[PDB]
């Protein structure tokens, strides 16, 4: 289906993860992966495997939008181990061809709850089960809740109550994870500082389709891109389309693959307890 081309060493500053289609052509995971994998099955770009810490996401401003590691004041970012969790507690990522339009300014986020740990840059199909709406100091932050359609138990999951039923504690832990991530203190002062509520599958799909329409406007130049890189190699109706062979130079000009990988700071091991 899709595959990955990794440039430079993982957890280095130059590390990039580009996506390739069935034919070895470089494509943007933002723009060139269809939102739908099949009827009622959404594509998901996996950005971080469950239980990892590196904060890696689609580069919304880089040509071909490769996955790369976030950087804060010159240092590569890792999420904290929030006791009792190890790193991210879901496969975490995004639905391609969507754009929370400002809004967070990138593809709509997905928490994927299935049993398989997915790889960085892996493209999976997911069944949308619901959506977590969070108020973070007034702003709206959406997290789709989904499960790998290839999960052995996928047939048992069709709405958010199924998550409550067959994975007790998962939704609570999700809210807790995001609350302690956003308010490192622990508890916010009121529902403006942090609020959380889950909505069902139909609501989630309405939100997703809305962000897909916003993306449609983005890649057809009907809305200010606000710095988003819209270069793509497959969208026939997009003025930002570029010849695939021309786009290969974007990858080939970067350091070659090196899978003798940089070691992760020991500080990432530390576990932070809520007091």
Q: How far is the CB of 163 from Mg ion (least distance, A)?
A: 21
Question: Between 32 and 106, whose beta carbon lies closer to Mg ion?
Answer: 106
Q: Which part of the chain contacts Mg ion (CB under 5 A), choosing from 10-18, 85-93, 94-102, 111-119? A: 94-102
Q: Does the protein bind Mg ion through residue 104 (CB under 5 A)? A: yes
Q: How far is the CB of 108 from Mg ion (least distance, A)?
A: 5
Of 117, 108, 129, residue with least CA distance to 87: 117
Question: Between 194 and 241, whose beta carbon lies closer to Mg ion?
Answer: 194
| HSE-up of residue 264 (Cα within 13 Å, Cβ side) | 15
Residues 109-128 contacting Mg ion, CB under 5 A: 109
Q: Does the protein bind Mg ion through residue 136 (CB under 5 A)? A: no
**Any residues with CB less than 8 A from the CB of 248 and at least 6 apart, and which?**
26
* Residue carrying the six token digits 């809004």: 103
Q: Exposed, middle or buried: residue 16 (CB in 10 Å: 0-12, 13-18, 19+)?
A: buried
Question: Between 108 and 247, whose beta carbon lies closer to Mg ion?
Answer: 108
CA-angle at 145, arms to 141 and 146, nearest 5°: 145
Q: How far is the CB of 105 from Mg ion (least distance, A)?
A: 7
User: Which H or E run includes 195?
Assistant: strand 194-199
C-alpha dihedral, 159 to 211 to 37 to 96, nearest 10°: -120
Is 104 labeled as ligand-binding? yes
Q: Does the protein bind Mg ion through residue 106 (CB under 5 A)? A: yes
Q: How far is the CB of 66 from Mg ion (least distance, A)?
A: 16
Query: What are 257's two structure tokens?
Result: 């693959």
Of 23, 81, 3, 27, residue with least CA distance to 251: 27
Q: How far is the CB of 258 from Mg ion (least distance, A)?
A: 28
DSSP per-residue string spanning 137-170? TTEEEEEEEEEETTSTTGGG-SSHHHHHHHSTTH
Q: Does the protein bind Mg ion through residue 70 (CB under 5 A)? A: no
Of 25, 16, 242, 215, residue with least CA distance to 1: 25
Q: Which part of the chain contacts Mg ion (CB under 5 A), choosing from 85-93, 106-114, 183-191, 253-261? A: 106-114
Report the Cα–Cα distance between both ends of the chain, in Å, rounded: 46
Among the listed residues 47, 62, 100, 122, the single contact to Mg ion using CB under 5 A: 100
Judged by CB under 5 A, the number of residues near Mg ion is 5
Q: Which part of the chain contacts Mg ion (CB under 5 A), choosing from 19-27, 103-111, 151-159, 177-185? A: 103-111
Q: Which part of the chain contacts Mg ion (CB under 5 A), choosing from 98-106, 174-182, 215-223, 255-263? A: 98-106
Q: Does the protein bind Mg ion through residue 32 (CB under 5 A)? A: no
Binding residues for Mg(2+): 104, 109, 141
> Binding-site residues, please?
104, 109, 141
Catalog residues that contact Mg ion under the rule CB under 5 A: 100, 104, 106, 108-109
């Amino acid at each position: 289906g899709f595959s990955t081309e990794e440039r430079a060493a993982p957890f280095s500053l130059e590390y990039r993860v580009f996506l390739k289609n069935e034919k070895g052509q470089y494509i943007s995971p933002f723009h060139d992966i269809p939102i739908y994998a099949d009827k009622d099955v959404f594509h998901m770009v996996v950005e971080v495997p469950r239980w990892s810490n590196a904060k890696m996401e689609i580069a919304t401003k880089d040509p071909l939008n490769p996955i790369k590691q976030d950087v804060k004041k010159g240092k590569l970012r890792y999420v904290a181990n929030l006791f009792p969790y190890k790193g991210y507690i879901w496969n975490y990522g995004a639905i391609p061809q969507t754009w929370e339009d400002p809004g967070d300014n990138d593809p709509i986020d997905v928490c994927e709850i299935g049993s398989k740990v997915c790889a960085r840059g892996e493209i999976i199909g997911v069944k949308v089960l619901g959506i977590l709406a969070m108020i973070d100091e007034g702003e709206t932050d959406w997290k789709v809740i989904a499960i790998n359609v290839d999960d052995p138990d996928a047939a048992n999951y069709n709405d958010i109550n199924d998550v409550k039923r067959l994975k007790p504690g998962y939704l609570e832990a999700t809210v807790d994870w995001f609350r302690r991530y956003k308010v490192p203190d622990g508890k916010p002062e009121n529902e403006f500082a942090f609020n959380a509520e889950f909505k069902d599958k139909d609501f989630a799909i309405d939100i997703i389709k809305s962000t897909h329409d916003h993306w449609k406007a983005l890649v057809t130049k009907k809305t200010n891109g606000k710095g988003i890189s819209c270069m793509n190699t497959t969208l026939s109706e997009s003025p930002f389309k570029c010849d695939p062979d021309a786009a290969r130079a974007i990858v080939d000009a970067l350091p070659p693959p090196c899978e003798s990988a940089c070691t992760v700071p020991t500080d990432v091991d530390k576990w932070f307890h809520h007091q």
